[PDB]
Amino acid sequence: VNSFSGYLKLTDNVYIKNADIVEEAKKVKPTVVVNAANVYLKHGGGVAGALNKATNNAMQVESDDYIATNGPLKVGGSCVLSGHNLAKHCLHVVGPNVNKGEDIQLLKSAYENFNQHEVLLAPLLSAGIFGADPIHSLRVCVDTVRTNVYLAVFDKNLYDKLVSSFL
């Protein structure tokens, strides 16, 4: 039993809700919140900009030190950093950016990072401002993630579409 409330069960291990991941994080304080990161950990907009704003820019300050030490992430890769006031940890995961010509096959690699964590609050990677179809992101999620994932979908219209077309 966990404290996620109001989620629609989609499969054995995937749950979904129309919500802002920032608000879900502030209410639940999960062990792991997933950020829809880019390779430079520049949290300007979308999920990343919203999460970083909620940390009063502490996420960005920590991220800049991470990059200065380690260099950029790989597309499909991830790193674990602090969750600040939103979660214990933030798993920064880089899905491919369709607008940059990046390989959508890397979306599966991106979701594989979730399997290193027993329970996560997460967005549909590569969707939103990253350019991919959220319906596709959801199918890759369900077919790749084996740990327990709670998805927060920001847009009500797309959520209803994601639910309606699922089975």
- Per-residue contact track with Cl ion, 11 to 50, x per CB under 5 A? -----------------------------------x----
User: Is residue 79 at the binding interface for ligand A1BCD, with CB under 6 A as the rule?
Assistant: no
Determine the Cα–Cα distance for residues 92 and 76; give it in Å rounded to an integer: 10
- Report the distance separating Cα 97 and Cα 119, nearest Å: 25
DSSP codes joined into one string, 40-90? T----SHHHHHHHHHTTTHHHHHHHHHHHHH-PPPTT-EEEEE-TTT-SEE
134 lines the binding site for Cl ion (CB under 5 A): no
CB of 21 to ligand A1BCD, least distance (A): 4
> In the β-sheet with 14-18, what is the strand arrangement from edge to edge?
8-9, 14-18, 148-153, 119-122, 32-36, 89-93, 78-82
- Distance between alpha carbon 74 and the CA centroid of its chain, in Å? 16
10 is a contact residue toward ligand A1BCD (CB under 6 A) = no
Q: Which is nearer to ligand A1BCD, 76 or 134 (CB)?
A: 134
Is position 123 an interface residue for ligand A1BCD (rule: CB under 6 A)? yes
Q: Please identify, using beta-carbon distances, which residue of 95 and 128 lies nearer to Cl ion.
A: 128
- The nearer residue to ligand A1BCD, 140 or 153, going by C-beta atoms, is 153
Binding site residues, ligand A1BCD, CB under 6 A: 20-22, 46-47, 50, 123-124, 127-128, 134, 152-155, 158
Binding site residues, Cl ion, CB under 5 A: 46, 128-129
